[PDB]
Design a protein around this ligand. Structure first.
Ligand SMILES: [Zn+2]
Ligand SMILES: [Zn+2]
Ligand SMILES: [Zn+2]
Ligand SMILES: [Zn+2]
Ligand SMILES: [Zn+2]
Ligand SMILES: [Zn+2]
Ligand SMILES: [Zn+2]
Ligand SMILES: [Zn+2]
Ligand SMILES: [Zn+2]
Ligand SMILES: [Zn+2]
Ligand SMILES: [Zn+2]
Ligand SMILES: [Zn+2]
Lengths: 189, 189, 189, 189
């Protein structure tokens, strides 16, 4: 109900009480600049040495991709980011008529799986995309990274994914949701 | 569990967290005058120029329908309103023995999909049916109109229906219910 | 989820919001005298004119049944009460080793479906079974009678059973459970 | 939903309201000493008269098993305890890389089904395993023993297992979870 449990030969049969207290999440960043046509080119005109650098993962990998002027519309930025296989995925939310936002989400959950973004050679587009440790309508975190916290027979376990299989001998716990406050889920193997 | 998610070719696979905070509702009005026989004629005797005007929808359309004396019982009013295809639907609730109420509900959900009712040439029936801006025993709002509010990866979306398909690229979300307070539903495409 | 909805030809299709606030319950009475053998005869020896009178139902019916001395053990009282088709049903709860209680429950739910019990010609057994308006280890109410309260499109409906079919035109609502505080169940016919 | 109900011929048909307030649990003890290789031998070198005594059950049985030096690693302790058929089951939790804990859990639920552990002839291993009445880094209770508390038609029942079949005549209740605070589960046989 709050998780699924698959079992191997190495599992020791007994009574278990499980608390799921947090689920692993993936950081998400989202643009805040008002964009009213997703096809509209947001970047400066004529730049030939523009690039976007994404830092993502654990351990972190940096990916630098070039961007032509044609590629600075939300639709083409998304397509570019997704093409990069850079450890994040990008998608466009249509808040309403003539109101669009680009969302960049880590591909991997975890408290320590944060994203950064840095545009080089285009301050205008940077003021829409750039994201790092400090902030001032700039790119904004809208989902916080976090690990899964769950307790197995009173013992607290923290992991970066929701598929916990490196904890209990011969058991995988695929986390689906939290368990109620004063109510661990009593299970029996 | 709090919604169903259908997917198209254009969807971008990733981790999503969803909050559903409100569901779209349809305004409902309900009579408050004590009526003890649903077949009993509630209107004045002998009027030949009686009508009911319903305003409903977005954008709003006005519908004027005539009502003969025979048509001013709850049962026939309901049948008249429903026959009108006027953007509202009408039904009789039997609170108990000898205690009936007529309910008129917008056909379309939304914060801005409000109903008005105006009887012309029958002050008595009007004192049962009329509903507008200014209002003991007159027609009364009993369900408030509202939009759906939900958040997709931390980004707030407001819509007038519970079938949200104009938000995320290649995703429909058919909302079924709210999600718990401190607990967005973690999904994976 | 909080109820099931069956539909007839007379139903008017539209948007409905439902609150279930209370479910109909059946009064239950339960003995409090310590009884350690369910076969043990609890009544006085030698009485030949003993009887139990049950009042139950709506409208109420009185049923007077005789009881031989052999019939004053919990097991035989239960069997006697159940044989009477007197509008209540009786069952024995085994709280633990050598600790038994007889439970008499109305056969019909409702705020106004209360039980009374009166033994005639056996004060000893009376001090275990008798139940009426005033009380002083005597028979005790342990489930309170109540009607179902639910609201349909903002309109409050009260009924004595959990199968509400005399309210909305061509709809039955079989109530299964309450709905959350600030959260009516949005349905669509 | 909060329990399953199997029925026999002896059941008396009627209306029942059930509260489940607690589920029976099994005591669990867990090591607190930092262990970074589950294969590493935790006991003293050269001892030939080492043993572990487990007290478990209701009524309690004592089991004394010998332990060779090779057997004092978490992996082998677990295998030894499980081999003993001593009324407890043992399993290793991997809190993280180089961080292991041994968990010993009663095989039987109940408030009165507590475990003790006593090592003889190995003060060092004892400082990891020993558990009794008087207790930083010693064996620790992490799940408390408890009975099932549930109420059936307002009458409180306490039992040491979650399969309650010695309470109501011809009914078993296999408890799955608690029921909400102000909301007993209304059932009908
Ligand atoms: Zn971590
Ligand atoms: Zn700038
Ligand atoms: Zn709602
Ligand atoms: Zn008037
Ligand atoms: Zn709106
Ligand atoms: Zn969560
Ligand atoms: Zn009533
Ligand atoms: Zn007396
Ligand atoms: Zn519990
Ligand atoms: Zn020591
Ligand atoms: Zn006990
Ligand atoms: Zn209830």
């Amino acid at each position: 109900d709050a998780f699924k449990i698959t079992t191997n030969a190495k599992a020791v049969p007994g009574n278990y009480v499980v608390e799921v207290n947090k689920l692993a999440q993936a950081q998400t960043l989202t643009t805040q600049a008002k964009v009213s046509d997703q096809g509209a080119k947001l970047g400066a005109e004529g730049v030939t040495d523009r690039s976007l650098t994404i830092t993502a993962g654990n351990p972190p990998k940096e990916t630098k991709i070039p961007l032509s002027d044609d590629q600075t519309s939300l639709v083409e930025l998304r397509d570019a980011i997704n093409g990069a296989k850079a450890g994040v995925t990008a998608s466009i939310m249509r808040v309403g008529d003539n109101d669009y936002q680009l969302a960049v989400s880590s591909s991997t959950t975890g408290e320590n799986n944060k994203i950064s973004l840095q545009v080089d050679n285009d301050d205008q587009l940077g003021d829409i995309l750039n994201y790092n440790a400090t902030r001032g309508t700039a790119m904004k975190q809208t989902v916080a990274p976090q690990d899964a916290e769950l307790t197995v027979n009173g013992t607290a376990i923290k992991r970066s994914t929701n598929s916990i299989s490196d904890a209990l001998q011969g058991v995988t716990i695929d986390l689906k949701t939290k368990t109620k406050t004063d109510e661990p889920q009593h299970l029996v193997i």
